[PDB]
Design a protein around this ligand. Structure first.
Ligand SMILES: *[C@@H]1O[C@H](CO)[C@@H](O[C@@H]2O[C@H](CO)[C@@H](O[C@@H]3O[C@H](CO)[C@@H](O)[C@H](O[C@H]4O[C@H](CO)[C@@H](O)[C@H](O)[C@@H]4O)[C@@H]3O)[C@H](O)[C@H]2NC(C)=O)[C@H](O)[C@H]1NC(C)=O
Ligand SMILES: *[C@@H]1O[C@H](CO)[C@@H](O[C@@H]2O[C@H](CO)[C@@H](O[C@@H]3O[C@H](CO)[C@@H](O)[C@H](O[C@H]4O[C@H](CO)[C@@H](O)[C@H](O)[C@@H]4O)[C@@H]3O)[C@H](O)[C@H]2NC(C)=O)[C@H](O)[C@H]1NC(C)=O
Ligand SMILES: *[C@@H]1O[C@H](CO)[C@@H](O[C@@H]2O[C@H](CO)[C@@H](O)[C@H](O)[C@H]2NC(C)=O)[C@H](O)[C@H]1NC(C)=O
Ligand SMILES: *[C@@H]1O[C@H](CO)[C@@H](O[C@@H]2O[C@H](CO)[C@@H](O)[C@H](O)[C@H]2NC(C)=O)[C@H](O)[C@H]1NC(C)=O
Ligand SMILES: *[C@@H]1O[C@H](CO)[C@@H](O[C@@H]2O[C@H](CO)[C@@H](O)[C@H](O)[C@H]2NC(C)=O)[C@H](O)[C@H]1NC(C)=O
Ligand SMILES: *[C@@H]1O[C@H](CO)[C@@H](O[C@@H]2O[C@H](CO)[C@@H](O)[C@H](O)[C@H]2NC(C)=O)[C@H](O)[C@H]1NC(C)=O
Ligand SMILES: *[C@@H]1O[C@H](CO)[C@@H](O[C@@H]2O[C@H](CO)[C@@H](O)[C@H](O)[C@H]2NC(C)=O)[C@H](O)[C@H]1NC(C)=O
Ligand SMILES: *[C@@H]1O[C@H](CO)[C@@H](O[C@@H]2O[C@H](CO)[C@@H](O)[C@H](O)[C@H]2NC(C)=O)[C@H](O)[C@H]1NC(C)=O
Ligand code: SDR
Ligand code: SDR
Ligand code: NAG
Ligand code: NAG
Ligand code: NAG
Ligand code: NAG
Ligand code: NAG
Ligand code: NAG
Ligand code: CA
Ligand code: CA
Ligand code: CL
Ligand code: CL
Ligand code: ZN
Ligand code: ZN
Ligand code: ZN
Ligand code: ZN
Lengths: 690, 690
């Protein structure tokens, strides 16, 4: 038989290991020859594996690179203009790689050039709440200052956006051991902790889902008309550079001015964590100077797109995609994901060579330039948006398979909750102490649901990964799964040169059993979405969460009862809409269970497929035209986090500070109307069609 | 048998006549009790006729009405502030109706209040070219003036928009006998010409497809959050009032200043048609004073929505819709259309009572408030947009069935050209001298195609009618057909109190044979769209027109060869896209002809249905977010006319006057890229799906 169990049994830990080794011997930075060579290799291998067609889809997009002959660095500058301390020009390379060529030194992609000279202010994580604390409580003025911020808690671009708007002329980002050095664990190469010379790379764009900064809305193809740099989307306006904690210590140790307001502002370094501005009396006349010479350059990128044509519904697409580009070796990010995708393609291909085809078409994607702002997946979706929104059933992402070895982590639409629960009950747990038990059992024990007994935690989707354009712009049901760490007690080497094959094989997953379990979850999801007669979506699960989200947004508003009285702010329409969605979903599920008629089936499969699509508003969210999903959007304060009813949430955020409360509460009421209307309209897609 | 011929044979001229009489005895102005009573009657009758369900869909939208106790009028005002002449307070009512209550006096809907006093400038038709001539050639300054313009040639709102931007403080609109009095024909009631006391009503909004000015994007339902009047969409900012030619003569006869530049500026009145500004020397000290007291008021409107559920594909909708609201009696506009819709519903119902159902669902609509800006159809489409864009096969409009008695007029998407040609070859011509000949033969003889021998003229769609939201915002294939006049040699009584049943029965269509022929065309189109196994769309016809439109836009650009050299403006991408569309459409048509498999059929019917949808750009046209179709949009100078490649056309329009030619030609290049990309993307929807 060719059923799911046949597909799953063909997946092998040893193959995943072989592929991971093969993908991580040299750097694969977006836009470089080595990453084009890897694209060609994967294209060739996916053809060998048995896919019907495998093509490269290329685009010419804005990328950013350091200048090879004028390196980026930061200085402490004395009274005379002598540079008395300089940060590192590169991370000490890991053992055995000290002669590998073309390792990109640490930099912040898309930083402008500049050499700003100034006094530091230390801004904790540079979160919006951290800036509120500085300015409103401590009365510290960031205007004209260089801010030094520690990484962690939110996406780094959001930090830079916050720093900009606070008036800063530069940002130094660093990794504090409080956030990236786990107690009792050795630094790389003898454990998985971050050494003092390690540095986290990463882009600092604020694109809000636009993709290539020069071509928002349209693919960056050969005839594309590009915005000028001055009109580009999302580019930072102040120089930015990341450093390690050895170099950060040398910068923080002289900080004067105000004490930290409290212990949540102190990291683990042996420094005062003084907020500034400026250094203590002896060194009051020294300043910090940035030297940033990186250049933005339109560069060709390549996606690999593999097709396994459906036997019955070839015009319905289930997509498994993850990126291929890495900052350096990509040991975890993304090659632990890409190796899993490669073995999934191999397994589907094995079944295909034996005469099997899935019911629906499966598309497999190896995306380029994800590290520079999800550029490869976004340009491809812009090029193919008409096909995807009329044919796209689901998107399963496949970036890093592991970020820890403790338990499963799943983030997905409520439409896939039942599918995930059912699949994980049929898979074996890889965990110690759970041998012979299901993955559902181990996951639920380690990561319990906050609301329900005997259920696991599943998170929302925001951004930060290649599902973003599919889910937040186009409204295609999306999910992701990986193995993760224990939060109760990014990983330390994230985006550093130390993310290697050896890191994974020695410290994360020596037997590749966690990788195998992730391959079974992602591959299993794809198999069920592409083969189940009725799409494996349960609309009643959306109804349950919509009520939770409506309760939660109402509770936020109810912090301001006088204003709700004054401006007549009612959530009655939104609760009515959610109640109607609940009733209609219940009736639809009865019909689905109770309907030989392939027209009624496909009519009902179309109602299932277009249900996620119904939460899209074609006008987008306010000043964010490419975030269109009314229920979820990436948080306006943290791209990594999903926010529910984002339009209403943003209208309420810090509302007590708004200068015209009538207008502000009017906008809250407008967002309640948009949300209530969208929920009711989605509900009505599930009604009998005529 | 229940086939098309059975449907068509059941339609009767005598029933159309009976219904037209029934619909036109009292006024049915949007928002009034009489028009709600008619909605209830139609709902009841459509139920009786056999529809599965018939509901009222209501919305609360901005309407505009005169003040019953402070009437609108225009004055000539002397030096002392004595009003020496006043325009009429109402049109003399037609014979037998002089005691009918609730006739709305002539007014311009949505005019603001005001009493501006000034000197006139006569602006011909107030077209953009007329304003160019005044300002650039004659150096006449409209700032602070009351402009008097004649109706005709373009939609009246576009006139008011032009007048506003020229700085005017008021607009007087009038009907010149050159445009509304056919030579040798008697005035109403003794012929179909416009009498001197007749006045054309009509709204003067510039909504650009938004629908209700207070709720753009979302239905004006019970919980809607409304913009303030100051933020409303499309409202004119200067007072506007329409008058007849007896009253216009009294205003024009004193005009001084400059002579008309040429004979195309002179109408038929016995006046000089002097452009002004102001009156001749004897009366130089007199001014014109407007008195406008109309009020905008949120008012409930009602659409009737009838459903005939499909037997095989109930989730595919073919829509026949036209409006019900009229300015006064609606003898032609819209009741000549609504009477045809009523007989079509009756005929489909007859077949339904005998056990027949169409293959796909047919929706029938009686729209409200079309006269106030297509409000009823637009709010309904906003409410149901998710259902329509995933299920909508086609929209056939049904406003006035006649505007003349000479020949057929069809405006539609190229996807319906073959369907119309085939249907009209099977229908009998109603025309004198063509007895026993087909309607195709008579139409083609009277209205030949410009480009092809032995083919009829079919026009493009713009706006001005209720197909606008379906076609231009949502991308649902749309069409319209009516009987029209001979252009080689609006109709005179358009939007006047003289549009009565007697007008039609005595002067336009005494036997109701032209109405019957229109019922066969519209009803026949609906029958074929709702019943044909394969959708009756021919993608190759789109390929032919796209090449014509690309040739035409290139020719416009080629008026500026130096600039195209300087800024490297190439249309190569657009021609490549059109060539690819041609090739792919040809291959798709081969597969369609050559494919027992209902999945392949429906897959291919989905490719046909979503082909119009592929021409929608989710970002809309520049500053017009609700006009989304890249191939067609209503002209930016005349809402009634369709324009092809509107984005490029507007970027080229008057480009030689732009102050920064680099930026202007950059925008032309951007629009060429958007157009080329959209054509290629539409083409790719017709490729094999996997
Ligand atoms: C959830 O689904 C329910 C349907 O089960 C749906 O109920 C609808 O609610 C609206 C109210 O928002 C009802 O609207 C009424 O319709 C009648 C005509 O049928 C009108 O006469 C009413 O207007 C009068 O009363 C108003 C309220 O006091 C006044 O503001 C107004 O000026 C009039 O005097 C009113 O429009 C509608 O009938 C029902 N439909 C039903 C029961 O089938 C509810 O709206 C759905 N929720 C959401 C968020 O969509
Ligand atoms: C109409 O359909 C045809 C397909 O039949 C399609 O042809 C495509 O055209 C593009 C050109 O716009 C081709 O792009 C080339 O792709 C190759 C790789 O396959 C690249 O190496 C090429 O880039 C080099 O050359 C460029 C031009 O001088 C340079 O600008 C560039 O820097 C590189 O040196 C180039 O990208 C593409 O291969 C074909 N696809 C085919 C033939 O299958 C055409 O685009 C379609 N029309 C529209 C409007 O979409
Ligand atoms: C990664 O694996 C690929 C696939 O086996 C290797 O590429 C092959 O290399 C051999 C011998 O050098 C060639 O004969 C084949 O043509 C290649 N096949 C391809 C590209 O599909 C590649 O060498 C491996 N890389 C590493 C670092 O081990
Ligand atoms: C930090 O780096 C800078 C740049 O390389 C060093 O400054 C340069 O030193 C060289 C060697 O003497 C001189 O030729 C240049 O004139 C210097 N450039 C300057 C001062 O801007 C600097 O000495 C380094 N500091 C430390 C502590 O290594
Ligand atoms: C997950 O598994 C459950 C348990 O089998 C499925 O629920 C059953 O579905 C069948 C077929 O429709 C019904 O006959 C049963 O009554 C259901 N049992 C329940 C609800 O306890 C469920 O459909 C699966 N989810 C998927 C496939 O997405
Ligand atoms: C238009 O026709 C309708 C439908 O026949 C007439 O309405 C009917 O009037 C009769 C007698 O007055 C009532 O018994 C029915 O209940 C009505 N039927 C409906 C409303 O569906 C209406 O009178 C006609 N109007 C004119 C002006 O002739
Ligand atoms: C035009 O209409 C106005 C408004 O009705 C007339 O002016 C009014 O005349 C009455 C009757 O004598 C006076 O009571 C008001 O004081 C007048 N209002 C004014 C002058 O603003 C005016 O006479 C009419 N002109 C003609 C020629 O009929
Ligand atoms: C209009 O009528 C023509 C003539 O019958 C149709 O074209 C024929 O379609 C059949 C069935 O696919 C083909 O076998 C013939 O070769 C076609 N004849 C031609 C092109 O001359 C055409 O499809 C009809 N258009 C519709 C139904 O939209
Ligand atoms: C356009 C908004 C996102 C910015 C593009 C880079 C995205 C990149 N993503 C990542 O680095 C992701 C984050 C995650 O999903 O855990 N890393 C992994 C291991 O999945 C970044 O954070 O830098
Ligand atoms: C929002 C843009 C259109 C404005 C709404 C009123 C539309 C109204 N339409 C009409 O009066 C139409 C015009 C036509 O299609 O021939 N009249 C008829 C007889 O069909 C108007 O012109 O006044
Ligand atoms: C890189 O820096 C060198 C000098 O170190 C300079 O000559 C060159 O212009 C730069 N490269 C760029 C900007 O691409
Ligand atoms: C912060 O300091 C600078 C002094 O350079 C000043 O110009 C700016 O307005 C200040 N912002 C405040 C006080 O909010
Ligand atoms: C793998 O799990 C073990 C046991 O809990 C632990 O000692 C080790 O630190 C884990 N590795 C990582 C990278 O979390
Ligand atoms: C209409 O005009 C009368 C006086 O003629 C005035 O009292 C009333 O306010 C007006 N009605 C409105 C503005 O609806
Ligand atoms: C038109 O005339 C007015 C005089 O009231 C003037 O203010 C305005 O600027 C003029 N416009 C021109 C000359 O373009
Ligand atoms: C109807 O057609 C006849 C004959 O050509 C013509 O005399 C009459 O004017 C037409 N009526 C209208 C309204 O065009
Ligand atoms: Ca783009
Ligand atoms: Ca609206
Ligand atoms: Cl992932
Ligand atoms: Cl029409
Ligand atoms: Zn990644
Ligand atoms: Zn990453
Ligand atoms: Zn009309
Ligand atoms: Zn009209």
């Amino acid at each position: 038989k060719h059923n799911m169990k046949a597909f799953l049994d063909e997946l092998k830990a040893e193959n995943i290991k072989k592929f991971l080794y093969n993908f991580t011997q040299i750097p694969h930075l977006a836009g470089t020859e080595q990453n084009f060579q890897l694209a060609k290799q994967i294209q060739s291998q996916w053809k060998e594996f048995g896919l019907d067609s495998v093509e490269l889809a290329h685009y010419d997009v804005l990328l950013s690179y350091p200048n090879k002959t004028h390196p980026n660095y930061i200085s402490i500058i004395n009274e005379d203009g002598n540079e008395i301390f300089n940060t590192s020009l590169f991370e000490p390379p890991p053992p055995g790689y000290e002669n590998v060529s073309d390792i990109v030194p640490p930099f912040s992609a898309f930083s402008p050039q500049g050499m700003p000279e100034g006094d530091l202010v230390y801004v904790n994580y540079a979160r919006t709440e951290d800036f509120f604390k500085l300015e409103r409580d401590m009365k510290i003025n960031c205007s004209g200052k260089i801010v030094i911020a520690r990484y962690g808690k939110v996406f780094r671009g959001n930090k830079v956006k916050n720093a900009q708007l606070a008036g800063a002329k530069g940002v130094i980002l660093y990794s504090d051991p409080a956030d990236y050095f786990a107690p009792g664990v050795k630094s790389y190469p003898d454990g998985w902790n971050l050494p003092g010379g390690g540095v986290q790379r990463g882009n600092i764009l604020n694109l809000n889902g636009a993709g290539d900064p020069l071509t928002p809305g349209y693919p960056a193809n050969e005839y594309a008309y590009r915005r000028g740099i001055a009109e580009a989307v999302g580019l930072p306006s102040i120089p930015v550079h990341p450093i390690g904690y050895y170099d950060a210590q040398k910068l923080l140790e002289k900080m004067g001015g105000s004490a930290p307001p409290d212990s949540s502002w102190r990291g683990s370094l042996k420094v005062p964590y003084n907020v500034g501005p400026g250094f203590t009396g002896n060194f009051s006349t020294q300043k910090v100077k940035m030297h940033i010479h990186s250049t933005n350059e339109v560069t060709r990128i390549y996606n690999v797109i593999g097709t396994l044509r459906g036997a019955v519904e070839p015009d319905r697409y289930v997509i498994l995609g993850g990126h291929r580009d890495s900052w350096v070796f990509g040991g975890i990010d993304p090659q632990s994901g890409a190796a899993v995708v490669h073995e999934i393609v191999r397994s589907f291909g094995t079944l295909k060579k034996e005469g099997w085809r899935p019911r629906r078409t499966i598309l497999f994607a190896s995306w380029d330039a994800a590290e520079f702002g999800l550029l490869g997946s976004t340009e491809w979706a812009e090029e193919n948006s008409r096909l995807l929104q009329e044919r796209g059933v689901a998107y399963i992402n496949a970036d890093s398979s592991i970020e820890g070895n403790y338990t499963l982590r799943v983030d997905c639409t409520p439409l896939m909750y039942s599918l995930v629960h059912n699949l994980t009950k049929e898979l074996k747990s890889p965990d110690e102490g759970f041998e012979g038990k299901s993955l559902y059992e181990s996951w639920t024990k380690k990561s319990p649901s906050p609301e329900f007994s005997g259920m696991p935690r599943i998170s929302k989707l925001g951004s930060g990964n290649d599902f973003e354009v599919f889910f937040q712009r186009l409204g295609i049901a999306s999910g992701r799964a990986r193995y993760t760490k224990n939060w109760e007690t990014g990983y330390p080497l994230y985006h550093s040169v130390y993310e290697t094959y050896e890191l994974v094989e020695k410290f994360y997953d020596p037997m590749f059993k966690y990788h195998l379990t992730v391959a079974q979850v992602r591959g299993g999801m794809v198999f069920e979405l592409a083969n189940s007669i009725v799409l494996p979506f349960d609309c009643r699960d959306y109804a349950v969460v919509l009520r939770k989200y409506a309760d939660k947004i109402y509770s936020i508003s109810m912090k301001h009862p006088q204003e709700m009285k004054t401006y007549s702010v009612s959530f009655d329409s939104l609760f009515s809409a959610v109640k109607n969605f609940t009733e209609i979903a219940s009736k639809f599920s009865e019909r689905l269970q109770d309907f030989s008629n392939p027209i009624v089936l496909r009519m009902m499969n179309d109602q299932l497929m277009f249900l996620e699509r119904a939460f899209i508003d074609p006008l987008g969210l306010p000043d964010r035209p490419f975030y269109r999903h009314v229920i979820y959007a990436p948080s306006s304060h943290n791209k990594y986090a999903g926010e529910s009813f984002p339009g209403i949430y943003d209208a309420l955020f810090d509302i007590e500070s708004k200068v015209d409360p009538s207008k502000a509460w009017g906008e809250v009421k407008r967002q309640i109307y948009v949300a209530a209307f969208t929920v009711q309209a989605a509900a009505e897609t599930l009604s009998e069609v005529a």
